[PDB]
């Protein structure tokens, strides 16, 4: 929005705004640069955007052309999950049933992450993300 | 008479050999011919084999095939005193066959079709698991009702009138007669509409004779079935959609799953196919035309849910904010389009089968469902189907930004209109084509191609009643220049010409109708004029046709105008040849005798559809830079000269400016260039002639 941004940079637009707006994909937060840039530049800590705890990392920033942070991270984690799995029972002869089959347990799995449920299905899926991931390190 | 004769037999060998003839009509008199060509040609067989497909472009001109349909009814019952199984069905507009919208709505939106959804839903609910009924229903599939028609005709009006006579629908009463295979005369946005072609093309189960009538739009309606403007309203109308979707996902997960997780298992085992074919009078979605999609197995989101169907579609219209929210000046692929939305997101080419079935789905799981949202719906619907399929000669444009605030806009470049016309080439034979407004008739053998015959018009007689003169020399031949730029040059010269149509209407006071090239020029002359003698001397008032129409604006200024004619005052009908409303009904008096023309026809350039058919009809046709500026400027110049034309015992006289207007041809090429002052003095001894050789030539 144009009046949150940076809890202390919340309004600069009759500042110039020629800064950006970083967002660390551990707190879904948004840091103007001259802030951020001190925070992982004095060490790893929280921001304090409205009282966040997650603690903010050094680099590992992106852009965000804003998508709601529900789709972005529906579409990080659908990308994440889908190089996991890869193209395992996929395209591997033609199947049309077995493979709709997978898919709506992947979707199902996003689904429940999206979700959270009661943080107890979604352990087990990361499970499943380490064991599918040793089946394509194999 | 025989040129209508002749006609006649063209119709009938075209009929027995031919699959598809273009036949050159003149105009005013060629109306009768085919329609009692066609039930002659249909008895001659055998009674019932082939039925009249009649498509004409406007509804006056399915009225005058309703009447003129009847004078065949009478002409044939009263010339042999016996009674046969009539046809004739009156297919109109849905607001106009329905009567409930009368009594308590007192509303002709759009909208009609869902509040009689809502009717009907309220029928198969309390048929089912218990608003009321209707008016009257439930009689209205029965045989008598199925046999009002074939005994005595109720076509539209007296449709209409039976129907509050007798306490029926007449909505279900066409719907049930289409399948009755009756005469019927709908629009030409009817049998190639991506929503109604499919029922239609399902009900007359094919076999019969189309009748293409004034086919010259046929390109702009094939044109006309695409071309969506996305403009950035359109994006909050599908996030509030999105957002009622998301409760609508939290009502059906809260407390009543179950109907979700069957129709979900109907999907699964039976798919689109059983979900089209279990549902039995639900309201429908909109479609890419599925004779011509040809597209089966539609899997349900890849055997998902509706959670994943809105989860990936608020993913889309994010996209598609995306995509709206650009630079300025950028064109797309369709291709590319997509390979650059897979690359944001994979989402494949299934998103068509991923709405088509999705949207039945909702519509199942709804009893409830606003308006907006679920057209936004459909839009979005529409657009993913069209980026899923349909991509060869389709191109997807964004409109540059002008101010940048009022410009996120993105439109669909349709495709070949040659693909959309094609199915009634299998699905049917003798398609005759029929238009009293083509000339040259090459440009369709050229443009849409399909092997068909060439049959030009063979009637010219009594060229002393068909006044035809062109003005050339204005007094000065500077405002026939000045007169061509899209953007009107020197005012004064514009003032100047105002002032001759001011003379030229003084000198012929019997009903004027002047035509121009579009409303800018309108515009600029009525707001000073420096005169107005015509208003207070002979025309009493003026009648203007406003630049954004308006029905009963329209409606009153065309009874205005009967009454201004039959009080023998007259008026200017100031009109615009690419406006609404072409007009059509003529032979009396209460027409212009006298019909003026400001130069020739133009179409607004610099634009980007303009190129991009350009060019694509540069590849295809290689006919660049020479038939944009002719062939649509003919056509809407022969809309203004039909309107003169009007049997052989009226007379008229059309004045066209510009002398490009010899290099394009016209209906009966007899006209003699000369001056506007001389076209005065001769126009004025031609009022007189045309008034002495009518009882001398009877
Ligand atoms: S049954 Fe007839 S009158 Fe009633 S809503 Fe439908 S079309 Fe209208
Ligand atoms: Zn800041
Ligand atoms: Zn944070």
């Given at each position: 929005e144009n009046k949150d941004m940076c809890p202390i940079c919340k309004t600069d637009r009759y500042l110039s705004p020629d800064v950006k707006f970083l967002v660390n994909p551990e707190c879904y937060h948004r840091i103007c640069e001259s802030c951020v840039d001190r925070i992982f530049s004095l060490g790893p800590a929280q921001c304090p955007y409205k009282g966040c705890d997650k603690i903010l990392r050094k680099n590992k920033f992106k852009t965000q052309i804003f998508d709601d942070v529900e789709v972005e991270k529906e579409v990080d984690i659908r990308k994440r999950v889908f190089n996991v799995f890869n193209k395992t029972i996929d395209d591997f002869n033609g199947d049309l049933v077995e493979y709709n089959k997978y898919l709506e347990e992947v979707e199902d799995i996003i689904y429940k992450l999206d979700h959270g449920i009661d943080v107890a299905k979604t352990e087990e899926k990361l499970r499943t993300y380490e064991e599918l991931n040793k089946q394509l390190i194999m | 008479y025989p040129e209508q004769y002749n006609y006649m037999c063209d119709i009938k060998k075209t009929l027995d050999v031919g699959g598809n003839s273009i036949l050159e009509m003149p105009s005013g008199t060629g109306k009768t011919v085919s329609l009692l060509s066609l039930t002659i040609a249909y008895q001659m067989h055998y009674p019932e084999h082939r039925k009249i497909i009649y498509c004409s472009r406007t509804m006056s001109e399915i009225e005058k095939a309703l009447v003129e349909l009847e004078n065949l009814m009478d002409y044939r019952t009263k010339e042999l005193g016996y009674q046969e199984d009539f046809r004739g069905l009156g297919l109109t507009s849905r607001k106009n066959l329905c009567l409930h919208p009368e009594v308590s709505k007192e509303r002709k939106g759009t909208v009609v079709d869902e509040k009689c959804r809502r009717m009907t839903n309220g029928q198969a609910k309390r048929k089912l698991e218990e608003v009321e009924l209707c008016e009257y229903h439930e009689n209205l599939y029965n045989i008598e009702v199925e046999d009002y028609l074939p005994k005595g005709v109720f076509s539209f009006e007296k449709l209409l009138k039976y129907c509050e006579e007798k306490t029926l629908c007449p909505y279900f009463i066409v719907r049930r007669m289409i399948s009755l295979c009756n005469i019927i005369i709908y629009s030409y946005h009817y049998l190639l509409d991506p929503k109604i072609a499919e029922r239609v093309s399902n009900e007359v189960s094919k076999d019969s004779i189309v009748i293409f009538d004034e086919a010259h739009n046929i390109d702009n309606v094939c044109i006309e079935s695409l071309s969506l403007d996305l403009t950035t309203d359109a994006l909050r109308r599908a996030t509030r959609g999105a957002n009622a979707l998301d409760e609508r996902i939290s009502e059906v997960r809260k407390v009543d799953s179950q109907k979700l997780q069957d129709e979900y298992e109907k999907l699964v085992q039976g798919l689109x196919x059983x979900x089209x074919x279990x549902x039995x009078x639900x309201x429908x979605x909109x479609x890419x035309x599925x004779x011509x999609x040809x597209x089966x197995x539609x899997x349900x989101x890849x055997x998902x849910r509706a959670e994943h169907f809105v989860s990936f579609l608020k993913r889309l219209i994010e996209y598609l904010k995306t995509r709206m929210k650009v630079l300025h000046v950028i064109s797309e692929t369709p291709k590319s389009f997509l390979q650059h939305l897979k690359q944001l997101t994979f989402i494949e080419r299934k998103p068509l089968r991923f709405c088509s079935e999705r949207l039945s789905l909702l519509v199942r799981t709804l009893e409830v469902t606003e308006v907006e949202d679920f057209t936004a719906l459909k839009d979005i619907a529409t657009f993913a189907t069209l980026i899923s399929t349909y991509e060869e000669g389709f191109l997807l444009i964004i409109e540059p930004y002008e101010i940048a605030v009022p410009n996120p806009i993105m439109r669909f470049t349709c495709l070949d209109a040659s693909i959309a016309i094609k199915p009634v080439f299998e699905r049917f034979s003798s398609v005759i084509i029929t238009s009293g407004t083509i000339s040259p008739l090459d440009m369709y053998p050229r443009m849409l191609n399909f092997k068909t015959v060439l049959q030009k018009s063979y009637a010219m007689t009594l060229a002393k009643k068909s006044f035809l003169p062109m003005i050339i020399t204005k007094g000065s031949d500077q405002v026939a220049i000045s007169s061509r730029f899209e953007i009107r040059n020197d005012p004064s010269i514009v003032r100047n010409y105002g002032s001759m149509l001011v003379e030229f209407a003084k000198i012929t006071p019997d009903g004027m109708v002047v035509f121009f090239p579009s409303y800018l020029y309108m515009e600029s002359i009525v707001?000073?004029?420096?005169?107005m003698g015509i208003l207070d001397e002979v025309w009493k008032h003026k009648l203007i046709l406003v630049e954004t129409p308006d029905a009963q604006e329209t409606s009153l200024a065309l009874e205005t105008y009967r009454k201004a004619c039959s009080n023998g005052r007259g008026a200017i009908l100031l009109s615009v040849a690419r406006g609404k409303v072409s007009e059509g009904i003529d032979f009396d008096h209460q027409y212009g005798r006298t019909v003026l023309m400001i130069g020739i026809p133009f179409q607004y350039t610099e634009s980007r559809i303009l190129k991009a058919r350009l060019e694509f009809m540069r590849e295809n046709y290689r006919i660049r830079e020479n038939d944009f500026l002719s062939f649509d400027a003919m056509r809407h110049a022969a809309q203004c000269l039909g309107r003169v034309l009007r049997g052989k015992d009226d007379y008229g006289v059309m004045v066209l400016a510009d002398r490009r207007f010899s290099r394009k041809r016209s209906q009966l090429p007899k006209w003699i260039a000369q001056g506007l002052s001389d076209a005065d003095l001769n126009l004025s001894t031609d009022m007189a002639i045309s008034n002495t050789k009518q009882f001398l030539r009877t």
């Open positions: - | 707001s000073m004029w420096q005169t």
